[model samples]
Target chain A: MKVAVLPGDGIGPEVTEAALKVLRALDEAEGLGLAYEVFPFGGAAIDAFGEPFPEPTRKGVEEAEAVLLGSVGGPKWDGLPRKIRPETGLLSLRKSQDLFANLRPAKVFPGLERLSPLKEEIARGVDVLIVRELTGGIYFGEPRGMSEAEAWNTERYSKPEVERVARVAFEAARKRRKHVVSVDKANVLEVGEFWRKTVEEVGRGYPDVALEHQYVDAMAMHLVRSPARFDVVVTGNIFGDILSDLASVLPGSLGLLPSASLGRGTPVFEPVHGSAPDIAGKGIANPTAAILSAAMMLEHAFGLVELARKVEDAVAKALLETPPPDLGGSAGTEAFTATVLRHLA
Target chain B: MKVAVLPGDGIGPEVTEAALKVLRALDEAEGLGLAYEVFPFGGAAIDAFGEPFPEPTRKGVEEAEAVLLGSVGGPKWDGLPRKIRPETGLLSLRKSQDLFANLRPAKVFPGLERLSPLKEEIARGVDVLIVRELTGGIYFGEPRGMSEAEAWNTERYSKPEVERVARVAFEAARKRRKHVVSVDKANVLEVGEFWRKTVEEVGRGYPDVALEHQYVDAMAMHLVRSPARFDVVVTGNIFGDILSDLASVLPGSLGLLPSASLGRGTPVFEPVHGSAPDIAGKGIANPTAAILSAAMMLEHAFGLVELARKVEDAVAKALLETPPPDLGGSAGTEAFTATVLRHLA
Candidate 1:
């Protein structure tokens, strides 16, 4: 498989390198055919070609079968124009790929239960996959502008938009616990009602998967009170943005979470944590999330579920044995990645 | 002061009665000179007059100096039409009275720290006031309609709307901790940008208060991880609807949380917990929130801060000394109210 690797700014190069090292180990040992090319992106691309997302990088990203991206953005690009800032590269990538669905999996790692903000019992067994519609809704809806006196934005959802994302949630749910909770503000917003109806239409195709609807406000309360009750939850762009981040805090470990963006093009895999400019070159940044992102790619992008499990199991075993600096252990990126590789062997 | 009491349905009457008992004790002890009128609303109103928000109840509610409300809604009314449902009465009241700013204070009472879903360290000392703009955002925004193929709603904000709510938050912050975080999606929505600017303008007037801006997504994360770090949070309607409910769960005991909705007309105070129909006639539903709502009415509606503190002190003492059935103790509603009244005397 051809993989496009975009090593962005700050600690991006180092963490992605940690992931590649693990992939190379698996490739050589298991005779897995993996070919990858590195491309500069974000601030790196701006420094190299005066464009955050250069033309060459776009070609490689679009041509590859899978794109494994590292984190982007820092204060270094803050003073630049908004169009040229490092963060624009991410929006550009998402738009060019038409990446409409964002998948964030938040789960409490074994032996890390005490880290959760919630009590051990409430935080335990919290394995929720949040499928967020990335392209539509209020985030990018039309008829939006602001003035000195008034402003407005639209939250619009087409049938096809809700149907596609609903299918993704149901499909994902079928593989997991076979339960899907579709969240909306149906009692209020008109878009919420359409979303509910369209999702129900899509849900009918998967009779094996159980489907239920919850108002977003009530959903917010339930996510905190009984997080374990949810399995695969899906919602619109803005609601998902809030709820997913709300769920992210429950696990209490951003450095161990992975995310996937899928749509009408090649899927992209990345860690949920950003590039830590403060710890960029210190070699002390946690690489567990980056490595787990690769495992996600193996499962979601390449259909190598067994191979992905091996990587995930190794990462878990390594974390159980040697905590990273972020998790209050002394292991640096190299040390942590080395432990994962050792476990894989 | 005249107070309209609408104990809607289910546990509503019992809880409101408990609050009135406490109020009567305070009235006698402090010479409060408070007068109240009880009216049927929600399902009760529907049963009497075939309408949720009937003419008689509306007249009583609007004519009062303050409105003390109990929880509404029940399974018995769930099958009614959208307009005739119990919830519509609450919405009608908000719209008719123009209740724009909703204040929800989430604080872990003394000896209740162990009950929070969060760890002791994280959940302790968490006292936050979330002032949510209730009337105008996407919930009631115009140009909203849904077709079989698509749906859309507007998130509109005007200068007057933002300014009033911003002032409410700042004014509330002035009395307590002098910090306010105005939350928006300034990075994505134009309305968010306008909201940020408008709030900044309003914040400038409150020189004694410290002000800052936070995107709603990041705010969601911080509210879970570092809830104690915030003092007062203000946001537009939809965002407030989500975040306030999110904050309500932090105390882990919804039975003890109270809220107030204020506007140009009379202010309405209510408990955050809904009508728990299952425990309606069981004498097991907690009345702490209802009594606290009365305390809030005393302070906010009549400026009787001293009287409010006396009632609050009595409720806290009762909860600390006698465990209500809902809180894992033997005291029922009557037993708990007696404890509070006895303490007040």
Candidate 2:
């Protein structure tokens, strides 16, 4: 399988290299035919081609079956205009790929509960999957304007948009806990009211999965007070953005979380963290999220379920045995990657 | 001062009575001329006059110098139509009184650190005050609609609206930690961009207070990870509604939080909890939030700073001496009120 790799900026290249080492080891061990094509993006792209998402990178990503991206953007590219900025590059890529559904999993690994901000009782047993509708909603909605005197933005949701994302949540629920909590602000927002009804109609097709509803505000509190009570959560772009980030902290480190953006075509998987400029070349930046993203690509893009399970098990075992520096351990990227490789069967 | 009290539903009356007992005790101890007129509201008003906000209640509130509400809404009013629901009553009151700013304090009181869901170190020193613009934003913005095929809402903000709230935050910051964090979605939304600019202009007048900008999503996460790092947080209505509720859980007990809605006229003070029906007549419901609301009313509305400090101190002493049922003790409303009264001097 052909995979597009974009090691964007700062510690991005370092972590991506660590993940590639694991992938190469697996390829050698079990004849998993994997061909990787690396391309520059983010600040590196701006320096080489005068723009963050260069034409060559876009063409390379489209030619591949799936894309693996390291984190993007740093203070070096923060001075650029909105269109040419590193974040804009990532947003443009997602839009070009039509990535509508974003899946983020936040689970506390064993032996790392003490790293969480919550008490032991509240932090333990928290394994939640957040299904966020990413492509549409207020972020891309029209009729938006800003001036020195007044500003406004519209929050719009179509029937098909809500229905498609609802199906993604239900399908995901069936694989795990068989429960879905659709979150919205129906009591206040008209769009939220429509979202709730559309999700309920779609949920009728999946009778085996239990469906419940909660307000976005209440869900924010519940995610902190009782995160273990939830299996899968579905919401619009804005609420999902806030709730997912809030859940990211429950497990202590952003460097340990991975995300997947899926659509009709090839999907893009990446770490749920920004490029750490401060620790770029120090060899201490965590590679856990990037390696996990590769495992997600194996499962979701190539349908290599068994191989994906092995990668996940190896990573879990490594974390429980000896965590990386991000979780207050002394292991660097190479050390952590070697530990996971050793644990792989 | 003439105060309008609305002991709305279930545990609402129980808690309000507790607050009133403390007020009467203070009145007898010192010549604090505080006269109160109680009026029915929410479900009680609907039962008595077929309307949630009765004409008599409106007239009484308008004529008073300030207002103190216990709590509103219960399952008894859940079956009402959208327009006559108990929540609508509170909304109508805010609109009629033109209450534009909402102040919510989320502080981890001393000696009650164990009650928090966070680790002791993270929860011990949290003292944050959120200043929210309540009258205009997505919740009250125009151009809202819902249909079978689609739905939409507008998040609109003007320069004057943002400026007034920014000034309130600055004024409040001057009295405390002298720092303000203006939270918005400026990176994506036009309203947020304009809000950031407007708040910055208002900040120019307050040189002593440090002003910073943070996106709403990041603020939501930071509030969970490091709540004590904040001092005064200013944001629009919808974001404030969500973040304040999230902060409410940090202190462990919703029954101990108070809120104030301020405008050009007299303000309305209330507890940040509902009229809990299950614990209504049990008399074991906590009254800390309601009494604190009265204390806020004293300082913000009546300008009785010393009296408010006395009430706050007494409540702190009482909580440390004999914690309430919500905090693992068994002190009922009357018993808690009596303990606070004993420490008032």
Candidate 3:
């Protein structure tokens, strides 16, 4: 898989640098067909071209199949014009892509559920893949404006809009457990009812996969109680934003969280965290998400399912070898990525 | 306090009858004030008067200062109208009284951590009170309808609406933990920003209680990560509806949960659970919530704080004696209430 790397700034560069080595290690040892070409994005682009999405980087990522973002923004970029700002750079990238689905997984590996607020009995070996419709829901719905006394946001979903996202969910589930729970406010919202019907239509195409529907509120309660109940959970924009963030905590560490923002254009994989400028060149940041983001790419973008599992298992195997500092181990960014590489080799 | 009792149907009457015994016990012993008059409401009223809320029952409850409802609805009431149904009967009650603030508490008492999905360390001693603005916000906001292509829900909060709910939160916090974490979506929604500002103003009136602000997403994260972090949480209608349901799972057993619905008129205290018509004569249903419902009323309605604590203590003491049937103990309805009365004596 060929991926465009946005090694933005601070630990962003540090961790992106870490994952790049793993890609090369697999390519050299296993003919993994991996390639990572770096682009100076975010703060790096601001300094290099004064425009976060410089033409060269923009064209380069457009020519590539997928993207990996290491994280962006710091206090230094705060003074710049909001137009060329680091945060705006990411926003620009989002609008540039027709990314429609996002995938965030919450997996509590063996012996790690102790870190979660959820009991070990329910949390252990719990793996839930959340497939969120990235675009077209209440957040971006038309007629969304608010005032002190009144505010309104209209939630609208076309049949095709729901169909496309629902297919994404069913496809992802087919790759894993073959069970997908499409959650919505179907009992109340008309958008939800439409959403449910469209998803049901999509589920028919995937005859091997099982389908279930639940209300958003019931999903929230069940997620808290028995998260193991779900394999691939899908919902529309705003609901996904909440559920994705809620499920993010189930893994017990923010540093290890990886998110994929998909659209009609190039899919972008990024760590769901910010640039820790304070830890900028310290090499203390976790490279788990960055490395796993590539692992995710192989499965989704590359259709190399076996290779994806191998890379992800190696990352897990390395975590057990020398625990990362985030999980109470002494290994830093370089060392942890090297451990993952060693296991891969 | 003068009160009207609505022991609706099935196990509703059973548990309501048990709590009445506790009220009588406390009245004779501590002069703790329980002058409750029973009336036919819900199914009982429907049977007698062919209306869920008969004129006599309406007049009787209106004349009282507060209300105690056991529960309502069953398979039998499934055939009723969109109007004058058991559920509509409550809406009529809420509308008649202007019941704007809905209060729900999730408390994991000592040795009851086993009832929750959370780890013992996190769920133990966890007490969080959620004050939701019932009459206003997105759920009831105008311009709320949906089409096949879209649905719109207007979220609006007047200055007075936010102020009244915020005051309820702070006042409740002052009686318990002296800390309020007002949750909203201030970063994006205009109503949230106004809610935050109005809540800040209300906080000034209760300087003795500390006030903190958090985004709705952040609150969801913290609520899952560390429930002990919050004391009293206040939010608008829809957010509260989501969060209160999310928090409801913290206490393992639904049988012991209680809630209070407050407005400008007489308040209504009731168990969060529903009437179990199947257990109508089994004597196995727990009376924990109905008893505790009255206990919460002491501090909220009658302004009898110490008495409230004392009554709650008796329930806790009774739990230690033979645990309620719902919590896997041998004690039944009347037996559990007698144990609580014994502890009170």
Candidate 4:
């Protein structure tokens, strides 16, 4: 499998190395064919080639079957023009690769269940997967701008956009709980109504998966009150953005979450953490999310489900034995990675 | 003081009576001169006069200095025509009265801290007041509908709309922790950018209040992770609708939450709970939220700060001594109200 590794900036490099360590260990032990080519992106890319998403990096990512990104950008690149900023690069990459659906899973790990903001009973069984439409909806909708008198943005959704993401959620649900909650504001917004209808249409194609509908507001409340009740949730871009982040809190820290952006071409897997500039070289940055992102790449990109499960089980075991600094332990990036490697051995 | 009481449906009448009992107690004890006029609205009005917002009901509400709504609508009114439905009455009332901003305080009360969905430490100091712009933004914005191919809604906020709500939030913050978090999606939407800029401009007048801006997505996460870190949160209608409901989970029960809708005219105060058609006539409904709504009316509508504090303190005292059935105790509506009335005396 060919992979483009983009270790952006700050603690990104440290975590990226940890994930690579695990992947390399798997390659050596199990004789799995794995090939990784490093590519500079984000702030590092700006420094190397005067642009966050350099042509060479884009070409490398396109040529690869999958891509793994560490966290990206920091205050150092904030002053740059929006077009050249690190986040802009990430956005451009999504557009270029046609990466439309983003999958964010919020699972309260066994030993770290107490770390959840929710009470013990409510937090204990929470394992939700949020399937978000990334490229469409209000974020990229047209007729959006400001005037001296008023500012406006259109929240528009096409049938195809909703169908594609709904399919992604149902397929995911069939693997887990066979339940998908399609969230929207159907009572108010026409876009939401249309999105709901499209999702129902898509649901007809997957009779094995049960479908449920919830308004965004109610879903937000339910996520906090009864998170485990939800298996997979599908929604438009704006609602997904809010709900995904809200779900991130259920796991206590974003440091333990990983996400995948998939489309027709090569998919990209990345950790949910931002570039922690303050803790960049402190040697205590958590590498769990990054390593988990690689596991996601194995499952989604390389179709190595058993390998992915082994990687995940090892990490879970490692976490219980040696908690990362973010989880109130003193283990650093390398140390934590070594623990996971030890579990694998 | 004249108050229009609209006990719309099912549990609405029960909770409204409980609130009135407390008000009458205050009147008898302190000669508060509290007078109330009952008005038909919502499903009740539809049944009585064939219209949800009957002319007499409108006049009664208009003449009164303040309005108190117990709750509105139930499954019985689900099939009503669009214009005469229970919710239509609410929309018409808001339009007529110009009720633009909604104040929802989700404070984890002292005795019921364990009721919070969050862990005790995270839920302890949470006393957040979410000020949401109610009458504008996507909900009421023009150019909204659907077609065979696509559907859309416009999220528009003018300067005046943003400024008025921002001022409300800043004023509220000054009276509390002197900190305000203005939430938006500025990085993605132009309307969010305008909202942030307008809020900043309004903040200039209240130099004593510290202001911070957060993307709506991040704010949603932070609210779950660290709700106590916030004092006052102000945002546009769509964002606020989602965030307010999200905050509602912090308190763990809608039975303990109250909301106020304010604009140029007399504000409308109401409990966040629905009519609870299933438990309506059981005599076991929780009235804490409705009673607290009256407390909010005393403070915001009547400017009776001491009276409001007494009402609030009395309710808090009552909750600890005789917990309501909703809070896992045996006290029914009247029993709980009696506990509060005893404390007031």
Local distance difference test, per candidate? Answer: 0.89, 0.89, 0.83, 0.89
Best by TM-score: 3
- Residue runs of model 2 more than 4 Å from their true location after superposition: A28-31, A45-56, A73-85, A205-208, A277-282, B45-52, B74-85, B205-208, B277-281
Docking class of 1: high
Evaluated with DockQ, which candidate comes out highest?
Answer: 4
What local lDDT score does residue B169 receive in model 1, on the 0 to 100 scale? 94
Residue A64 C-alpha lDDT in model 2: 85
> For this target, which candidate reaches the highest lDDT against the unseen true structure?
4
After the best TM-score superposition of candidate 3, give how far the Cα of residue B173 lies from its true spot, in angstroms. 1.9
Candidates ranked, most accurate by DockQ first: 4, 1, 2, 3
Residues B1-345, model 1: lDDT tens digits: 799999988899999999998888787877878799999899988889898888888999889999989988888899999999999899899888888899998887767778888888888889899999987898888889988779999999999999999998998887668899999999888999999999998888999999999999899899888899999999998889889988999988877999999998889999988998888888878899999999889877887877777777788788888989767889999999999898888
- TM-score of each candidate's B chain against the true B chain: 0.93, 0.93, 0.97, 0.94
**TM-scores of the models, in the order given:** 0.94, 0.93, 0.96, 0.94
For each candidate, report its DockQ versus the true two-chain complex: 0.85, 0.82, 0.58, 0.86
Compared with the true structure, the alpha-carbon lDDT of candidate 1 equals: 0.89
**How many residue pairs clash per model?**
0, 0, 8, 0
DockQ of candidate 1 relative to the true structure: 0.85
lDDT tens digits by residue: candidate 3, A31-107: 86766688889988999898898987888789888887889998889999999999999888887888788899888
Candidate 1 residues A6-37, lDDT tens each? 97977889999999999999999987788999
